[PDB]
Every structure is written in structure tokens, then in C-alpha cells.
From Swiss-Prot:
Subcellular location: Host endoplasmic reticulum membrane
Native source species: Severe acute respiratory syndrome coronavirus 2 (2019-nCoV)
Functional note: Responsible for the cleavages located at the N-terminus of the replicase polyprotein. Participates together with nsp4 in the assembly of virally-induced cytoplasmic double-membrane vesicles necessary for viral replication. Antagonizes innate immune induction of type I interferon by blocking the phosphorylation, dimerization and subsequent nuclear translocation of host IRF3. Also prevents host NF-kappa-B signaling. In addition, PL-PRO possesses a deubiquitinating/deISGylating activity and processes both 'Lys-48'- and 'Lys-63'-linked polyubiquitin chains from cellular substrates.
Regulation: Inhibited in vitro by GRL-0617.
Annotated protein name in UniProt: Papain-like protease nsp3
Designated gene of the protein: rep
Reaction it catalyzes: Thiol-dependent hydrolysis of ester, thioester, amide, peptide and isopeptide bonds formed by the C-terminal Gly of ubiquitin (a 76-residue protein attached to proteins as an intracellular targeting signal)
Amino acid sequence: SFSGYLKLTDNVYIKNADIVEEAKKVKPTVVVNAANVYLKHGGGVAGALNKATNNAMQVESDDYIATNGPLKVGGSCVLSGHNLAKHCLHVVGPNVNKGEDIQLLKSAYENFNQHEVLLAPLLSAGIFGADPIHSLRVCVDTVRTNVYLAVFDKNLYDKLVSSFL
Ligand SMILES: CC(C)c1ncc(Cl)c(C(N)=O)n1
């Protein structure tokens, strides 16, 4: 199962890892994507996960949006995990760089409670512009299911662990 994680709480674990490499290694039931409402996987975690699927994630996502329309900020959808996981849970955290409401981060993390165990990034972190320390706090205070967080940046991982209350 998941290896090398630091246990933060009863159900939240964290590791300095590339979520793509982690997903290819574990092949978890659920990998979370840091999605946008359009499922346009251009950069950050979404661009990296999509590139690992040879764009199959984007082709599937475009068919999903053509049928259903965009997701809501704070919402999610379950699609295939392709070569990375059984499923991909595409979760839309607020993008602070697009002037979106940071209060929607708790709603975004609530999507994780529909899955017993997940491999995930910190929502709204990175190119989404939120403070990753705040994202980890919301994660631990919202998610009740088993969440294995992959933090790509070593310096951020160390800052997250050393400042964890
Ligand atoms: C009825 C189908 C199209 C549906 N409705 C809503 C969602 Cl959120 C999902 C999903 N892929 O998780 N699928």
C-alpha cells in the first residue's frame, strides 16, 4: 500500500513525492486531480496527471464537459484513473489567482469524504494561489476518510510538517 508517509492525524498522511510517480507506483483506488471547472488539464498537478495518461484524461474530460457542462468551484466528478489509478476524483478547489472565494476550499475537501482512501494533492495550492499551510489545515479539519497527501516541493513539505499544529 502507501509507503514513506508521515502520519499527521488519525486519517491524514503526508509525503514529499511527485503525485504522478506515486500514482504509477501505488495505482490507488482514487487519485485526486487539482481540476478546474472546465476540466482543462493544462498545468500544475492537472497538467502533470494528464500528461502521464498520454492525454487520455483530457479526451475523457472533454467528452464529460460536452455532456454535462462545467463543474462548480468546490465540486467534483469521478472519472477514469487511466494508467494512474482505478478512478480519478477531479476536485475543483478555489483558484485565488482567478479571484475565487477561498471559503470554498472546505466544500472542495468535503468531496474526499465520499472515498475511503485517496492519494491527493493539497487543494488550491501551487498555481491555484492559496496558502498550502491553510490548505493542509482545512484538509485535516474536513476530511474524515484516509487521505495520503503528496507534496511535490521538498521545501514546502518541510515547511508544512514543521509548522503542523
Ligand atoms: C449522471 C452522471 C453524468 C454524473 N453526474 C454527476 C457526477 Cl459528479 C458524475 C461523476 N462522473 O462523478 N456523473
